[PDB]
Design an enzyme around this catalytic site. Structure first.
Site, PDB file in Angstrom:
ATOM      1  N   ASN A   1     -25.487  18.388 -48.549  1.00 58.68           N
ATOM      2  CA  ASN A   1     -26.535  19.351 -48.867  1.00 58.68           C
ATOM      3  C   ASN A   1     -27.089  19.151 -50.266  1.00 58.68           C
ATOM      4  O   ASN A   1     -28.197  19.611 -50.553  1.00 58.68           O
ATOM      5  CB  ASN A   1     -26.065  20.776 -48.713  1.00 58.68           C
ATOM      6  CG  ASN A   1     -26.149  21.274 -47.318  1.00 58.68           C
ATOM      7  OD1 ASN A   1     -26.866  20.737 -46.477  1.00 58.68           O
ATOM      8  ND2 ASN A   1     -25.424  22.338 -47.051  1.00 58.68           N
TER       9      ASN A   1
ATOM     10  N   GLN B   1     -21.423  28.718 -38.066  1.00 65.00           N
ATOM     11  CA  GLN B   1     -22.813  29.082 -38.310  1.00 65.00           C
ATOM     12  C   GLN B   1     -23.684  27.886 -38.571  1.00 65.00           C
ATOM     13  O   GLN B   1     -24.780  27.793 -38.019  1.00 65.00           O
ATOM     14  CB  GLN B   1     -22.933  30.042 -39.486  1.00 65.00           C
ATOM     15  CG  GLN B   1     -24.373  30.495 -39.907  1.00 65.00           C
ATOM     16  CD  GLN B   1     -25.095  31.451 -38.953  1.00 65.00           C
ATOM     17  OE1 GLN B   1     -24.555  32.480 -38.543  1.00 65.00           O
ATOM     18  NE2 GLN B   1     -26.340  31.122 -38.629  1.00 65.00           N
TER      19      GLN B   1
ATOM     20  N   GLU C   1     -22.200   1.186 -27.959  1.00 64.54           N
ATOM     21  CA  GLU C   1     -22.851   0.110 -28.669  1.00 64.54           C
ATOM     22  C   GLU C   1     -23.000   0.484 -30.117  1.00 64.54           C
ATOM     23  O   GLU C   1     -22.903  -0.376 -31.002  1.00 64.54           O
ATOM     24  CB  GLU C   1     -24.206  -0.191 -28.042  1.00 64.54           C
ATOM     25  CG  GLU C   1     -24.114  -0.748 -26.627  1.00 64.54           C
ATOM     26  CD  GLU C   1     -23.387  -2.069 -26.556  1.00 64.54           C
ATOM     27  OE1 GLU C   1     -23.725  -2.986 -27.304  1.00 64.54           O
ATOM     28  OE2 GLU C   1     -22.471  -2.184 -25.744  1.00 64.54           O
TER      29      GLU C   1
ATOM     30  N   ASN D   1     -32.189  23.295 -42.844  1.00 63.79           N
ATOM     31  CA  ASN D   1     -31.776  23.094 -41.487  1.00 63.79           C
ATOM     32  C   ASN D   1     -32.801  22.303 -40.748  1.00 63.79           C
ATOM     33  O   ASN D   1     -32.473  21.675 -39.730  1.00 63.79           O
ATOM     34  CB  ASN D   1     -31.533  24.408 -40.812  1.00 63.79           C
ATOM     35  CG  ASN D   1     -30.307  25.009 -41.254  1.00 63.79           C
ATOM     36  OD1 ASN D   1     -29.394  24.304 -41.625  1.00 63.79           O
ATOM     37  ND2 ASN D   1     -30.248  26.311 -41.267  1.00 63.79           N
TER      38      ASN D   1
HETATM   39  N1  LIG Z   1     -25.725  22.498 -42.543  1.00 59.58           N
HETATM   40  C1  LIG Z   1     -25.739  23.725 -43.068  1.00 59.58           C
HETATM   41  N2  LIG Z   1     -24.969  24.002 -44.108  1.00 59.58           N
HETATM   42  C2  LIG Z   1     -25.100  25.286 -44.509  1.00 59.58           C
HETATM   43  C3  LIG Z   1     -25.903  26.264 -43.983  1.00 59.58           C
HETATM   44  N3  LIG Z   1     -25.757  27.457 -44.676  1.00 59.58           N
HETATM   45  C4  LIG Z   1     -24.856  27.177 -45.585  1.00 59.58           C
HETATM   46  N4  LIG Z   1     -24.433  25.874 -45.560  1.00 59.58           N
HETATM   47  C5  LIG Z   1     -23.443  25.190 -46.394  1.00 59.58           C
HETATM   48  O1  LIG Z   1     -22.229  25.105 -45.650  1.00 59.58           O
HETATM   49  C6  LIG Z   1     -21.168  25.415 -46.563  1.00 59.58           C
HETATM   50  C7  LIG Z   1     -19.927  25.786 -45.809  1.00 59.58           C
HETATM   51  O2  LIG Z   1     -20.024  27.166 -45.522  1.00 59.58           O
HETATM   52  P1  LIG Z   1     -20.789  27.519 -44.177  1.00 59.58           P
HETATM   53  O3  LIG Z   1     -21.290  26.296 -43.521  1.00 59.58           O
HETATM   54  O4  LIG Z   1     -21.713  28.643 -44.436  1.00 59.58           O
HETATM   55  O5  LIG Z   1     -19.591  28.046 -43.311  1.00 59.58           O
HETATM   56  P2  LIG Z   1     -19.668  28.625 -41.837  1.00 59.58           P
HETATM   57  O6  LIG Z   1     -20.203  27.554 -40.978  1.00 59.58           O
HETATM   58  O7  LIG Z   1     -20.395  29.898 -41.985  1.00 59.58           O
HETATM   59  O8  LIG Z   1     -18.186  29.012 -41.402  1.00 59.58           O
HETATM   60  P3  LIG Z   1     -17.560  30.468 -41.116  1.00 59.58           P
HETATM   61  O9  LIG Z   1     -17.782  31.263 -42.375  1.00 59.58           O
HETATM   62  O10 LIG Z   1     -16.119  30.177 -40.804  1.00 59.58           O
HETATM   63  O11 LIG Z   1     -18.268  31.026 -39.916  1.00 59.58           O
HETATM   64  C8  LIG Z   1     -21.787  26.550 -47.358  1.00 59.58           C
HETATM   65  O12 LIG Z   1     -20.923  26.834 -48.443  1.00 59.58           O
HETATM   66  C9  LIG Z   1     -23.099  25.870 -47.721  1.00 59.58           C
HETATM   67  O13 LIG Z   1     -22.835  24.897 -48.704  1.00 59.58           O
HETATM   68  C10 LIG Z   1     -26.723  25.955 -42.883  1.00 59.58           C
HETATM   69  O14 LIG Z   1     -27.505  26.704 -42.286  1.00 59.58           O
HETATM   70  N5  LIG Z   1     -26.563  24.636 -42.480  1.00 59.58           N
END
Ligand SMILES: Nc1nc2c(ncn2[C@@H]2O[C@H](COP(=O)(O)OP(=O)(O)OP(=O)(O)O)[C@@H](O)[C@H]2O)c(=O)[nH]1
Ligand SMILES: Nc1nc2c(ncn2[C@@H]2O[C@H](COP(=O)(O)OP(=O)(O)O)[C@@H](O)[C@H]2O)c(=O)[nH]1
Lengths: 423, 422
Positions: free
Chosen positions: A202, A11, A250, A224
């Site tokens: 984050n 996601q 590079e 994001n």
């Molecule tokens: N870069 C980014 N990090 C996010 C976002 N939403 C949540 N996170 C952070 O990413 C951490 C890891 O969980 P997620 O990234 O939500 O996990 P995921 O990508 O949903 O993975 P699945 O649940 O396996 O589909 C979360 O616990 C938040 O700290 C987002 O939109 N972008």
């Protein structure tokens, strides 16, 4: 060819990529609705798009997820008809925030389709420069399929450069309690498979949104942004006539002396985000310095106290070459580099710009303070593991205690390797 | 995909589910019983099967005794598709062994055929939810047989349960503790997680906070339904964290067998809609984490949290939540100091009848007092003497009854060992 293929995984990966693609299109004057072009094309489409003879510029990327959700939202609603459907790859079940499921369970079958479909994309490229993957570090599928894919990429494409951009979990932003372990497994494999990676914390971004952007009630929809905004700037050199790091190779030369220590911090400014952001300054006498200020550090590390191993400082737009050159005079000396390497900030610029800004820039910094990021993650991990919390959600799929220990050791080694360079 | 099949077993199950599905339909905009819907919102397909100018709950009804099928056929009404009602030739008294050991085999085949239908109609299973009381001849008798047979077919699909533990409110010096312990054993063996609903606790809440002099069992169910809908709602009105049922399981249970959860909600809604409170996050948290509102009657305020999470339903400012939470963390510490163990999520869809619903789930060490009470009743009726009325023909050997007790003692001991406050 100079072609780059993006792999957006999970996601966070697909959502940030969706935003990236919307913005790159704007830069190239492309219409989100299948990327036809509003007349002439600006920038070099050869890097990120298939130049259909039909005038369709096909973004070259895969959208990969275990949950058949974000892929449908993006393919059908946010960038409808933009991404080629054959490259939307998905599973049936997601992981319950568990690396082990993402890596050992679901996805073990899917990976053949992922890699076969990647091959099909690579196969129509004149010549790849490399791959760029985007994901959450500690995401179940993010670290899971992400790392599995990386392993298979390294096996199938032995001479291509593998880059990744990834997002670390923080004390305030996280959807899981088991992160810290998904994160060290994820980090461990990346140490072993990637050539270069940019890591965004984050924690940092929050802090920036909260106090520098002035946005209360921070939400992922804004975070994001700043992530996609930095990404579109970092990768910008690959889209234009310019100098400095105009090729992934590079970048590696300039940014990773010695092995393993290839974790870079992102620095980006201005954070116009969505505020009117009228600018009474935008002066280079500030911008050049701003990129060494904590206010624009997406890593949550103070570059003031540490040793640089590398730095690539990129400017865009109307900036004077000489004014920047003069600006660096007041940076060097606040910034120090290791005595065992060629030193100095390498910098330059490309006279183009994103909508709304006359001048802007970013920096990739490799310095010893990255160790602190790792130290925070390891500390949480060490506590989890030593008393056995949540082990079962990993053990159940075969994720042995011995792999926990393995990742523990390699990530700790990174930190040790950076710490020894302080003096 | 990520859809949920709900299995409703026994009369207690039917009565809670009735209230539940009526409330959920109303929240989505779907006419309960009948009337289709209007501009449906929320991720409806997780719990409902959209048919076409019709929605039905993705659910299975198990009525071992044929005498109660009309509680769904007519009282719940046309909302729950009657083809999903499964019943047997006869019932059971309140003897776990009757419902559990080699009885209703034909009924059970049909039960699972129906479960399988609801599963095949679903793109993927995000999990199963079971609802039943723990002391019933069918409720836990079949409920336990069902729990086990489901896992046999779907070992990787988490089963979450909301089970209602009995209390011998009016001198019920009966074999029921035997039923309660045997089902507790099976919950430990096969459920991924469960909410422990103790009627005694809930009784005291209805009496003290809902100001009800003598709630009928069917009125008690309103509080239960309020909890069930507001907990479940975290997965239907999308918020700030990307949650699923499997994810909730991972986040709230760090060890196998320590999966028994407490639940608490606020504001409680008076059945008569007699009054409303100012919806202040601070006030709501004060109620939610108070002992006075806990469904377990365990006083978690003296314990330690192994894991926990809080959902706010409706528009609440981050700035108020943070101060409310600071107050909570200052009172209730967490086990092993896992810094990642406490999560907060928000979504804007307010519940009907209030500006903000506040829901807390947690895994807390005082929950042992629930199981300790069961054990005590069991021991008095077992170690003192073999009270159980010859439950041997389709029953249990002493060793099986002892096995259950042993498993229960183990879970009690493990919570006690994790939280020695050292
Ligand atoms: N870069 C980014 N990090 C996010 C976002 N939403 C949540 N996170 C952070 O990413 C951490 C890891 O969980 P997620 O990234 O939500 O996990 P995921 O990508 O949903 O993975 P699945 O649940 O396996 O589909 C979360 O616990 C938040 O700290 C987002 O939109 N972008
Ligand atoms: N909270 C609650 N408890 C119930 C309800 N109905 C029955 N019980 C409890 O369930 C037990 C009786 O089992 P029941 O489900 O009614 O009968 P069965 O269908 O033959 O198993 C007793 O301990 C009751 O207190 C109900 O509607 N709500």
């Amino acid at each position: 060819g100079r072609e780059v293929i993006m792999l957006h995984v999970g996601q966070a990966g697909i959502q940030v990529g969706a935003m990236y693609w919307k913005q790159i299109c704007a830069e190239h004057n492309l219409d989100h609705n299948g990327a036809p072009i509003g007349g002439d094309i600006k920038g070099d489409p050869d890097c990120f798009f298939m130049k259909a003879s039909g005038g369709k510029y096909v973004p070259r990327a895969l959208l990969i997820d275990l949950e058949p959700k974000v892929v449908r939202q993006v393919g059908n609603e946010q960038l409808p008809s933009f991404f080629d459907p054959k490259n939307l790859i998905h599973g049936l079940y997601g992981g319950a925030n568990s690396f082990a499921k993402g890596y050992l369970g679901e996805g073990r079958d899917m990976i053949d389709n992922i890699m076969e479909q990647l091959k099909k994309e690579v196969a129509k490229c004149e010549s790849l420069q490399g791959f760029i993957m985007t994901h959450a570090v500690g995401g179940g599928s993010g670290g899971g399929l992400g790392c599995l894919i990386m392993e298979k990429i390294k096996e199938e494409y032995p001479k291509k450069i593998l880059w990744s951009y990834s997002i670390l979990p923080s004390p305030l932003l996280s959807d899981a309690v088991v992160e810290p372990y998904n994160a060290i497994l994820s980090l461990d494999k990346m140490i072993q498979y990637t050539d270069e990676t940019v890591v965004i914390d984050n924690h940092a971004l929050f802090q920036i949104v909260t106090k520098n952007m002035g946005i209360d009630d921070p939400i992922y929809d804004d975070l994001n942004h700043v992530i996609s905004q930095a990404l579109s700037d970092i990768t910008a050199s690959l889209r234009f006539k310019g100098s400095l790091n105009t090729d992934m190779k590079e970048f590696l030369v300039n940014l990773v002396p010695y092995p393993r220590s290839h974790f870079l911090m992102a620095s980006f400014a201005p954070m116009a985000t969505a505020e009117d952001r009228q600018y009474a300054k935008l002066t280079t006498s500030n911008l050049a310095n701003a990129l060494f200020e904590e206010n624009y550090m997406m890593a949550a590390v103070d570059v003031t106290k540490g040793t640089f191993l590398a730095c690539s400082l990129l400017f865009r737009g109307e900036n004077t070459a000489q004014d920047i050159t003069n600006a660096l005079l007041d940076i060097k000396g606040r910034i120090k580099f290791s005595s065992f390497i060629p030193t100095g900030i390498k910098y330059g610029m490309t006279g183009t710009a994103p909508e709304g800004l006359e001048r802007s820039g970013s920096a990739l910094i490799n310095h010893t303070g990255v160790a602190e990021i790792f130290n925070r993650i390891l500390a949480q991990f060490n506590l989890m593991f030593d008393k056995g919390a949540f082990l079962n959600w990993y053990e159940i799929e075969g994720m042995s205690k011995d792999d926990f220990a393995g990742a523990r050791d390699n990530v700790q080694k990174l930190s040790d390797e950076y710490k020894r360079d302080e003096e | 995909a990520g859809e949920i099949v709900c299995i409703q077993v026994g009369q207690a199950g039917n009565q809670i589910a009735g209230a539940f599905w009526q409330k959920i339909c109303a929240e989505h905009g779907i006419d309960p019983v009948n009337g289709k819907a209007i501009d449906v919102v929320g991720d409806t397909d997780i719990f409902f099967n959209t048919i076409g100018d019709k929605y039905i709950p993705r659910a299975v009804v198990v009525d071992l005794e044929p005498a109660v099928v009309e509680n769904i056929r007519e009282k719940f009404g046309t909302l729950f598709d009657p083809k999903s009602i499964v019943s047997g030739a006869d019932g059971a008294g309140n003897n776990f062994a009757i419902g559990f050991n080699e009885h209703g085999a034909e009924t059970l085949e049909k039960v699972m055929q129906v479960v399988e239908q609801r599963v095949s109609e679903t793109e993927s299973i995000g999990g199963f939810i079971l609802t039943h009381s723990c002391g019933g001849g069918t409720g836990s008798g079949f409920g336990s047989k069902i729990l086990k047979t489901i896992r046999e077919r779907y070992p990787k699909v988490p089963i979450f349960t909301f089970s209602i533990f009995p209390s011998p409110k009016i001198s019920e010096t009966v074999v029921e503790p035997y039923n309660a312990i045997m089902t507790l054993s099976n919950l430990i063996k096969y459920a991924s997680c469960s909410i422990v609903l103790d009627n005694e606790a809930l009784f005291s809440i209805a009496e003290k906070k809902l100001e009800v002099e003598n709630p009928s069992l069917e009125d008690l169910n309103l509080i239960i339904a309020q909890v069930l809908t507001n907990v479940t709602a975290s997965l239907r009105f999308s918020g700030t964290l990307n949650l699923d049922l499997g994810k909730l399981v991972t986040n709230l249970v760090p060890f196998s067998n320590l999966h028994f959860l407490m639940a608490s909600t606020a504001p409680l809604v008076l059945a008569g809609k007699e009054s409303y409170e100012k919806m202040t996050a601070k006030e709501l948290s004060a109620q939610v984490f108070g002992d006075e509102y806990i469904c377990a009657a365990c006083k978690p305020t003296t314990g330690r949290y192994l894991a926990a999470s809080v959902l706010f339903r409706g528009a609440v400012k981050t700035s108020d939540v943070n101060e409310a939470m600071a107050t909570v963390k200052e009172q209730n510490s967490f086990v092993n100091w896992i810094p990642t163990g406490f999560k907060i999520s928000k979504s804007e869809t307010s519940p009907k009848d209030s500006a903000l619903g506040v829901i807390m789930l947690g895994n807390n060490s005082e929950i042992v007092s629930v199981f300790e009470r069961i054990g005590a009743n069991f021991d008095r009726l077992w170690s003192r003497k073999a009270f159980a009325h010859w439950f041997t023909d389709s029953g249990f050997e002493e060793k099986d009854l002892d096995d259950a007790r042993a498993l229960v003692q183990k879970v009690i001991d493990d919570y006690r060992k994790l939280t020695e406050d050292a």
